[PDB]
Amino acid sequence: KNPKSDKFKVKRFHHIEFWCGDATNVARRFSWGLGMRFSAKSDLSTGNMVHASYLLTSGDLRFLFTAPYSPSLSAGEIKPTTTASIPSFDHGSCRSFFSSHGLGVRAVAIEVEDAESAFSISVANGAIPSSPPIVLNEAVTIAEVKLYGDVVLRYVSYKAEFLPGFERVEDASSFPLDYGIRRLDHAVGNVPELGPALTYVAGFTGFHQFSGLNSAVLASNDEMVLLPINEPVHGTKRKSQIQTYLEHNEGAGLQHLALMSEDIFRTLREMRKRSSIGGFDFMPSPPPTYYQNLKKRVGDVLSDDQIKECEELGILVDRDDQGTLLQIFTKPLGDRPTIFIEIIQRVGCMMYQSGGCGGFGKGNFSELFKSIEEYEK
Amino acid sequence: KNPKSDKFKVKRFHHIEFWCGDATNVARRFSWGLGMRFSAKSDLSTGNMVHASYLLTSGDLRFLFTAPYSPSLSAGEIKPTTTASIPSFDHGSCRSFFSSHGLGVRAVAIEVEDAESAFSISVANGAIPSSPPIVLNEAVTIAEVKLYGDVVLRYVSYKAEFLPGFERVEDASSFPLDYGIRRLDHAVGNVPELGPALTYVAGFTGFHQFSGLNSAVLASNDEMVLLPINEPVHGTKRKSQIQTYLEHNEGAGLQHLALMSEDIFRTLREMRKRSSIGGFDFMPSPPPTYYQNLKKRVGDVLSDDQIKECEELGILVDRDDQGTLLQIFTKPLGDRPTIFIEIIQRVGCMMYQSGGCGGFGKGNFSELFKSIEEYEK
Ligand SMILES: CCn1cc(Cl)c2c(C(=O)C3=C(O)[C@@H]4CC[C@@H](C4)C3=O)ccnc21
Ligand SMILES: CCn1cc(Cl)c2c(C(=O)C3=C(O)[C@@H]4CC[C@@H](C4)C3=O)ccnc21
Ligand SMILES: [Co+2]
Ligand SMILES: [Co+2]
């Protein structure tokens, strides 16, 4: 059931903003590791004396990397005279976030019809305000409310090129890398208590409900904005990875970003070639028994050659009533065992493809446990 | 003249330590951009609950990248029970350094005969202590004194593998990258006042003296440890780049690291191929007039084909009474216009090669000014 209860008009995920200590080095590592192009910048070279922000893109996926300059460079400014291109940015908030959490997502940004209206309706319905609506160059409106922990949900609306004040990147610095990633599929939060988190977020958005953890997924009307949230389950044999996250992150935050690929075989071939030369590492692949069991689960969807290619690349597969899901997880993106990335591709639910086609892979918890036991043999 | 006045036995540069917000992303970017192998680690996986430290190597060059974990992970520890592998590390100092300066060098480390003796003699001769000598696993001794700004000179001595507590890196994570870089040639500081800086450092080491700036170079007895120091010169037409450094760095710090290559043509070919895919950018190349003028300056040292290869790669050349110097400079390594890297290779002074052979390129200030004026034509 989908009661289509959004309290404002939501379109799609727009961008993800990482708060960094050095945006340059993180952005360059991510660009090479994920195959994303440098697309826009706002920094000293564009007149921004407050923060350095670099935008990477792959298809519709937009990753923004932001770090503060010395406050001394902008000491004479006030908010009405700021050279910051992102008006919600604050030196103290950014440094506090990074000191507390390390590298991680500060903002999950969605495009809405009217960010001013979205902000008002959200706060009227219980959202904790983080940054009020601000109109940039009479063209783009941005506002922010608290999502969980120190992560904000950022609303963006356009009257009619990322943000005013950002410059397109000189072609020579913009190498057209592309490993197949096309859009953000979902963004997952870890919280200490799932119940209150769900009630809060569903409360102010109207989003409906779509081992070691309990989870639920909030979704927009067309189920294209997908926001899973996890809480830990305590006392288990193996310690809850959600609890490990909360300890190393100093509390709630964004756990993983799932990036849809138009060709997950090519994406993973490209990413795995670069794992040891500056890119991202992947979690340990499942045993050969997992892929032998795949024939009985998805042999109608995937040929044996395609199943063999899943095995070459360490890809997991899950299936539900309506669609099939190919997925794989990176090791953590930075020093702490906190945020990681999922690469995903969905098969089915063709109407365009409906959002969440095939679910989120929860069947792979049991299929992996059983496959490792099967594999001790 | 070289009075060989070192107050203790100094061997060579040992390593450079960057203090980072996220060591993983900086280390991976540097590894790919410079062709350095991941060689050792000390982090959560090795039992270090305090800091994440990753060691990159290329030949004898050792780059260490360190970032703090949440203090909560080690809250129960005291110094006698610490799991830190680098005992001088402090969460507050590291966060304060990075907040103030951004990404940069915290420690210039030299190998000495006895780091305990070097520390005592240094402080007896005016050095400001930063971390007292500490013996690690009865095998390695480390001590630190202030060099300039928040940069420390770190003494390391070995009784008889980087540091105890570091583990060698799993071969699969250690891709054998190598673009030809072999050792640190010199490490350069920017200070507000050159005179007092020189007197202080030469005071406690016994090191002897080897537009927009004044400079002098301190050197060890065999002139293999080379420490240039710059101060700004004010009022000029173009603003002093040393002054720009001090403003954006919030004071004195390390300006550039010069990395010797055994084949600067290959190093620069390799680095330039990666500039736009996660590596390092280079400063604008000199005009064609610079390379036409090179025939008259170094035509006895470099064939026209070799001079043409310098032009392809943007390489600068300078010469003194005893040797020839090939050099090139990167753009700044991170967000702020502060630290950068020089790639260098020296021709001549064969006895092994004597240190500083060919100087440091100061002749290229005038040769570049004149070549740009020549090139307006
Ligand atoms: C193989 C072990 N494994 C590790 C992960 Cl992270 C994972 C996921 C995954 O991506 C997550 C989500 O998108 C949904 C929100 C939380 C739940 C579901 C969840 O865990 C699905 C199945 N098995 C998984
Ligand atoms: C082409 C413009 N240019 C930019 C740099 Cl950074 C540079 C250097 C260089 O590396 C530096 C040093 O190693 C020595 C210590 C300070 C002096 C000398 C100095 O500037 C030499 C010649 N020309 C240069
Ligand atoms: Co997921
Ligand atoms: Co130099």
From Swiss-Prot, chains A, B:
- The protein depicted here goes by the name 4-hydroxyphenylpyruvate dioxygenase
| Pathway in which this enzyme or protein is active | Amino-acid degradation; L-phenylalanine degradation; acetoacetate and fumarate from L-phenylalanine: step 3/6; Cofactor biosynthesis; prenylquinone biosynthesis
Q: Identify the residues that bind Fe cation.
A: H186, H256, E342
Gene name per UniProt: HPD
Q: Which cysteines are joined by disulfide bonds?
A: none
One MF term in the entry's GO annotations: identical protein binding
The record's GO CC annotations read:
cytoplasm
Q: Organism source for this protein?
A: Arabidopsis thaliana
**How cofactor binds (record note)?**
Binds 1 Fe cation per subunit.
